[PDB]
């Protein structure tokens with residue numbers, strides 16, 4: 001019951017990813033578990049976001 | 052899309068080639084700056100009259 005979810009954090013976002021991980025810890029459950037793949041990028045770059 | 056993207060060298064040369072172009076055309080004198088915007092254009096200012 002593994003659920004793969006992608007994520008995109010703009011370089012320089014720390015507390016956001018922190019709150020993301022904290023959220024991962026608090027809302028974790030025995031039924032299913034989210035398996036995030038995080039990718040840091042330049043959010044203003046359209047090419048980077050597309051890729 | 053292949054990562055990391057690698058650009059071809061020739062491209063820069065073609066770019067410089069295009070930007071250095073100065074020609075005569077329907078829009079008048081056509082010339083570009085380093086960034087690619089139009090330069091030395093003539094915009095005819097027109098008014099609608101009865102005739």
Ligand SMILES: *[C@@H]1O[C@H](CO)[C@@H](O)[C@H](O)[C@H]1NC(C)=O
Nearest residue numbers: 080082084089090091092093
């Ligand atoms: C062409 O554009 C440049 C950029 O502003 C300007 O300095 C120059 O006077 C222009 N030439 C004419 C004939 O308008």
